[PDB]
A paper describes a structure:
Pompe disease (also known as glycogen storage disease type 2 or acid maltase deficiency) is an autosomal recessive disorder caused by mutations in the gene that encodes the hydrolase acid α-glucosidase (GAA), member of glycoside hydrolase family GH311, and involved in the lysosomal breakdown of glycogen. GAA is synthesized as a 110 kDa glycoprotein, which is targeted to the lysosome via the mannose-6-phosphate receptor and undergoes in the late endosomal/lysosomal compartment a series of proteolytic and N-glycan processing events to yield a mature active form composed of four tightly associated peptides. A N-terminal trefoil Type-P domain is followed by a β-sheet domain, the catalytic (β/α)8 barrel bearing two inserts after β-strands β3 (insert I) and β4 (insert II), and proximal and distal β-sheet domains at the C-terminus. The narrow substrate-binding pocket of rhGAA is located near the C-terminal ends of β-strands of the catalytic (β/α)8 domain and shaped by a loop from the N-terminal β-sheet domain and both inserts I and II.
The proteolytic treatment yielded a polypeptide of ~5 kDa lower mass than the rhGAA precursor, which crystallized readily. This allowed us to collect the diffraction data extending to 1.9 Å and solve the structure of rhGAA by molecular replacement. In this study we employed in situ proteolysis to afford well-diffracting crystals of rhGAA and interestingly the crystallographic model we obtained corresponds to the mature forms of recombinant and placental GAA found in the endosome/lysosomal compartment. The precursor form of rhGAA contains ~14 kDa of carbohydrate and seven glycosylation sites have been predicted and characterized. We observed glycan structures of various lengths for five of them in the crystal structure, notably at N140, N233, N390, N470 and N652. We detected residual difference electron density at N882, insufficient to model a glycan structure, and did not observe difference electron density near N925. One of the peptide segments removed by proteolytic treatment (G116-M122) is specific to the lysosmal representatives of the GH31 enzyme family and its removal might be required for the generation of the secondary substrate-binding site in the trefoil Type-P domain.
Author numbering: 81 to 115, 123 to 197, 205 to 781, 795 to 952
The structure:
Amino acid sequence: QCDVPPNSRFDCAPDKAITQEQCEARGCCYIPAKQGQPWCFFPPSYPSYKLENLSSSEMGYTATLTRTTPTFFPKDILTLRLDVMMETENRLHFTIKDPANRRYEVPLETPSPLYSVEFSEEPFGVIVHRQLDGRVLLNTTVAPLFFADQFLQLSTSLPSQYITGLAEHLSPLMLSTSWTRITLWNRDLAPTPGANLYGSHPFYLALEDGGSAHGVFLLNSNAMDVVLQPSPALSWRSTGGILDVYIFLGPEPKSVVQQYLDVVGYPFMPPYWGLGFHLCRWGYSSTAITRQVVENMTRAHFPLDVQWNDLDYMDSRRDFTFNKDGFRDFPAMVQELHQGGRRYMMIVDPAISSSGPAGSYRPYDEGLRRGVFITNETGQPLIGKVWPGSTAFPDFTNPTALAWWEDMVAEFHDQVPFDGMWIDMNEPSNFIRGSEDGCPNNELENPPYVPGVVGGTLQAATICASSHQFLSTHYNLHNLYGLTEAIASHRALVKARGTRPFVISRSTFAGHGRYAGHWTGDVWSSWEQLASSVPEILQFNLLGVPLVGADVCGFLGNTSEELCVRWTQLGAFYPFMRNHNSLLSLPQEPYSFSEPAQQAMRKALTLRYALLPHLYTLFHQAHVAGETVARPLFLEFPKDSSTWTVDHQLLWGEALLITPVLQAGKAEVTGYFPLGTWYDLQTVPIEEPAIHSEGQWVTLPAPLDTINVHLRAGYIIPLQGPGLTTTESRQQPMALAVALTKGGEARGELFWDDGESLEVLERGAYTQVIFLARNNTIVNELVRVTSEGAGLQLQKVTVLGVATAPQQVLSNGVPVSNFTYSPDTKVLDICVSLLMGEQFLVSWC
Ligand SMILES: *[C@@H]1O[C@H](CO)[C@@H](O[C@@H]2O[C@H](CO)[C@@H](O[C@@H]3O[C@H](CO)[C@@H](O)[C@H](O[C@H]4O[C@H](CO)[C@@H](O)[C@H](O)[C@@H]4O)[C@@H]3O)[C@H](O)[C@H]2NC(C)=O)[C@H](O)[C@H]1NC(C)=O
Ligand SMILES: *[C@@H]1O[C@H](CO)[C@@H](O[C@@H]2O[C@H](CO)[C@@H](O[C@@H]3O[C@H](CO)[C@@H](O)[C@H](O)[C@@H]3O)[C@H](O)[C@H]2NC(C)=O)[C@H](O)[C@H]1NC(C)=O
Ligand SMILES: *[C@@H]1O[C@H](CO[C@@H]2O[C@@H](C)[C@@H](O)[C@@H](O)[C@@H]2O)[C@@H](O[C@@H]2O[C@H](CO)[C@@H](O)[C@H](O)[C@H]2NC(C)=O)[C@H](O)[C@H]1NC(C)=O
Ligand SMILES: *[C@@H]1O[C@H](CO[C@@H]2O[C@@H](C)[C@@H](O)[C@@H](O)[C@@H]2O)[C@@H](O[C@@H]2O[C@H](CO)[C@@H](O)[C@H](O)[C@H]2NC(C)=O)[C@H](O)[C@H]1NC(C)=O
Ligand SMILES: *[C@@H]1O[C@H](CO)[C@@H](O[C@@H]2O[C@H](CO)[C@@H](O)[C@H](O)[C@H]2NC(C)=O)[C@H](O)[C@H]1NC(C)=O
Ligand SMILES: [Cl-]
Ligand SMILES: [Cl-]
Ligand SMILES: [Cl-]
Ligand SMILES: [Cl-]
Ligand SMILES: [Cl-]
Ligand SMILES: [Cl-]
Ligand SMILES: [Cl-]
Ligand SMILES: [Cl-]
C-alpha cells in the first residue's frame, strides 16, 4: 500500500509539520526522502469522494460526489455536485460545487470534440484524453479530492515536463516541476524569485511530445498554492470558492491561448500613440523640470509620445489634486504637450486620504457620503496607511464606487486633460498590517491552510481578509482588486474622454488584458532583471495581456550606460515601452548618456517607430483573434522541440526574431534559429545578409551599437517614415519590407484606422490590406478600404533574397524612377509612388 515511487508521492501533511505516528494516524504513508518530496503521503487507498448517479444530458454530464471519511481539515463538504459541460469542440468545462449552499464564485461574463471525458468511480476522478492520439491530458484520479470550506485540492498528471503560466512570478518561461510551490496572492513586492508578486493568473499551458498542447484555467480568485512535482503532476490548492475548471484542447499552442482568451476576453485595442515611447520618473518635481524632459529629448532627436509624472504632481500625495508650488500651472503644461502632438499620463493610487478636515477633500468626503469604501467589522471604513498617510480603500465591486470613481476621474480631467491612467499600489498595497486597528481573530484572518505567501499571512502588506466588500469579503476578492480597479478606470476614461482608454496597471488577474496593460513593477537596474524581463513579457502575452513591458533601464538602483543601451535595445521590443526611474536613482533618460550611447538608443527608438504600423497590426490581431503580440519561439514553431526552453529570444508576431545581448561585456550573442531563411533587418534601409537555418543555434556579432533582429522569409512587414511623435510619424510615407522565400513567395498585412476612436471594428471605420509576393511580382489585395486608410502613400519597396540583378523594375507597367540592387546582400530597393488603398502591381526581371 505504501509502495509509491518517490516522484508520485502526494503530500498528506501540507498543513503542518508531522511525525511518523501522526502521519500514520491520518491514514497516510511515512517514508523519509533519502536527501520538497513529502515524507508523509497518500496511499492509493486514502479516502476520497465516490462518484454516484452519473447521468447524461445534451449539455454533458452531472453526478453526485460523496465523501464518507473526513479529511484532516475542518468543515469538509461531504456531498458535492459535478457538472460537466462539453461546450465546444475545443473547450471542456466542469464545476464541482456544494449543492446545499451557494459558495463564492468569481464574477466573469460568459465532427466530434478534440477531447473525450471519462470518470473513475472510487476514488473519484475526471480523465480527459486527446481523441486524435489518445494522450491523457487530465487525470484527477492521481490524488484525493479535498473540498472543505477553506481548502480545495484537485490534482492531475501532466503530459510532459513542459508547462508555462501561473503568473505573476520571476522565473523561466517553462516552470520547474522539481517540487515547486507557486503562490497566487497579489502582493506589493519588488520582483524576486520564489515570491508571490503583484498579480495572479491561475492558467497553465502544457506541451505534449510532438508539439501539441492544451491549457487549463481554474476560475478561482482565492489565495492558492499550485504544487508541481516531477512525475510529472500538478495540484491546485485553494483556500476558498469552488472548483471551476476549463480545458482548452488546442492542438496548437497559439490556439490554446486563443481558446483561453475566448473565455476571459480578447485583449483591448490600444490607441496608436500608446505604442510610442513613454518617459517617466519619480522626481520630476515641477512643471518646469518636467517640460525640460521633452525639450531635452527633442533637442537630441529622441522620439517621445507620452510624458508621465509619478506622485510629484499631487498635493501632499493625494489623488485628484495638484500642488500649487511646482505644479501650479499643471493644466497649461498638459495643454502644451497636446499642442506639440504628445500625450500625458500620471499615477493614480486606489487609497484615498482619510485624515483631512471634514469638507476639505472631496474624493474622501464624497466617498464617505456614498459608502464607496471597504468596511470593517463595525461597518466603518477600514483605514490603512499608504503614500498620503491614513487612507480608506475603495470597493470596486460596489456599483456606487464605480460611479464615484467615474465622477472623480471626470472632475479631475476637467481640470487637467490627462490621456490615461497609470494605476499603481492596487494589490491593494498597505504600509501597515491589515489596518490601523489591526484585524479581528476569525477563520478568514487565520485560515486552516495559509499558502506560501511572503510574510506567512494573508494580511501582510495588505488589508484585513475579513473586511467587507459589496460582492463578498476581501478574502475571496483580494486577487481581483487591481482587475476591478482596471475595469472601473477603463469605463471612467471612456466616459471622460470619448476615445479609447489607456490603462496601465500593477496588479492583475486573469482577463485583465480585456481592459488594460501591465508593467512588471519595481525591477532592479541589473543585468539579471534585464534578462528576466524577456520570459515575463512573453508570459503576459500568453495570458492575454500583450500590452506589457518592464521599466526600461530598470527602476530601482542606478543603471550603467552599458546596461541602459542593452535595455533600450531589447526594451524597444517590449510591446509597452516606458523608461521609468526611482526617486533616488541617477538619471537615465536617453539624452543623459554619452554620444555613442545616445546614438545606439536613438537607433533603437527609430527602428521601433519605423515598425509601428506593423506593431499596431499585431495588436489588432490580438484584439480580434486572441493572438499574442510578443511570443516565444515555441508558440510559432512548437513542432521543433529545441524551441521549448528558449526564453531569451522573442518573436514579434510570426516573422520578426529578436536576439538581444543580455550580459555585460559581450560583443556577440548565441541564439536559436528555427528552420528557414532569416534576413538581417539591418539590410532594409531605415531613415551576413541571411541566415539559412536547418533549426540550429547561431553565434552572431553583436557589438554595443547593435541588436540582432531578423525577418523570416515568406513575410512582408509594413513600415512608416520617421517622427518624434506618432502624430508626426503617421503622416509620413510608408514602405514595405518583403522577405522572399527561395521560391519567391511572401505575404503580409496592414490594418489602419484613425488610431484612437471607439468601436472602430463594429463601425467598419478601418482599412485592411494584404500584400503578396509571387513570381517576381508584389501586389496588394484590398480587404477593406475606407476614408481612414485612404491617402496612405507607399514610396519604398525593399525586397530581400533577390538572387539575380534585374534588368528592369516596373510599377503599374511603367519603369520605376529608380531602384538599386546590391549583389552582395541580394537586396533590391525600389522607389515608387503608390497608395496602400489602391491596387498596384510591382514587378522585376
Ligand atoms: C473600524 O474602522 C474605524 C475607522 O473607520 C476604527 O475607528 C478607530 O477606532 C479607534 C479605537 O478603537 C480610534 O482610536 C482612538 O482615538 C481616540 C482619539 O484620537 C483616542 O482617544 C483613543 O485612545 C484610546 O486608546 C488608547 C490606547 O492606545 C488609550 O491609551 C486611551 O486611554 C484611549 O482609551 C483611541 O486611540 C480611532 O481614532 C478610530 N479611527 C478613526 C479614523 O476614527 C475602528 O476601530 C475599526 N473597528 C475595528 C473593530 O477594527
Ligand atoms: C489515472 O490515474 C489513475 C491513478 O494513478 C490510474 O489508475 C491506476 O492505474 C494503475 C496502473 O494501471 C493501477 O495499478 C495497477 O493495478 C493492477 C490491478 O490490481 C495491479 O495488478 C498492478 O500491480 C498495479 O498496481 C491502479 O489500480 C489504478 N488506480 C485506480 C484508482 O484505478 C489510471 O490508469 C489513470 N488513467 C489513465 C487513463 O491513464
Ligand atoms: C442516487 O439516486 C437515487 C435515486 O434517486 C431517484 O431518482 C433520481 C433520478 C432523482 O429523481 C431522485 O430524486 C430519486 O430519488 C437515490 O436513492 C433514493 O433516495 C431517496 C431519498 O434518500 C429515497 O427516498 C429513495 O428510496 C431512493 N431510491 C432508490 C432507488 O434507492 C440516492 O440517494 C442517490 N445517491 C446519492 C448519493 O445522492
Ligand atoms: C545611486 O547613486 C547615488 C549617487 O551616487 C553618487 O554620484 C555618482 C555619480 C557616483 O560618483 C557615486 O560614487 C556617488 O556616491 C547614491 O546616492 C549616494 O549614496 C552615497 C553612499 O550611500 C552617499 O554618500 C551620497 O551622498 C549619495 N548621493 C546622492 C546624490 O544621493 C545611491 O546610493 C546609489 N544607489 C545604490 C542602490 O547604490
Ligand atoms: C535638460 O538639459 C539641460 C541642459 O543640459 C540640463 O540643465 C543642466 O543641468 C546640469 C546638471 O547636470 C547643470 O549643471 C547645468 O547648469 C544645466 N544647464 C542648463 C543650460 O540649464 C537639465 O538638467 C536637463 N533637464 C532634465 C529634466 O533632464
Ligand atoms: Cl518523526
Ligand atoms: Cl491531525
Ligand atoms: Cl460570498
Ligand atoms: Cl488534436
Ligand atoms: Cl522611489
Ligand atoms: Cl533562451
Ligand atoms: Cl547575452
Ligand atoms: Cl511608381
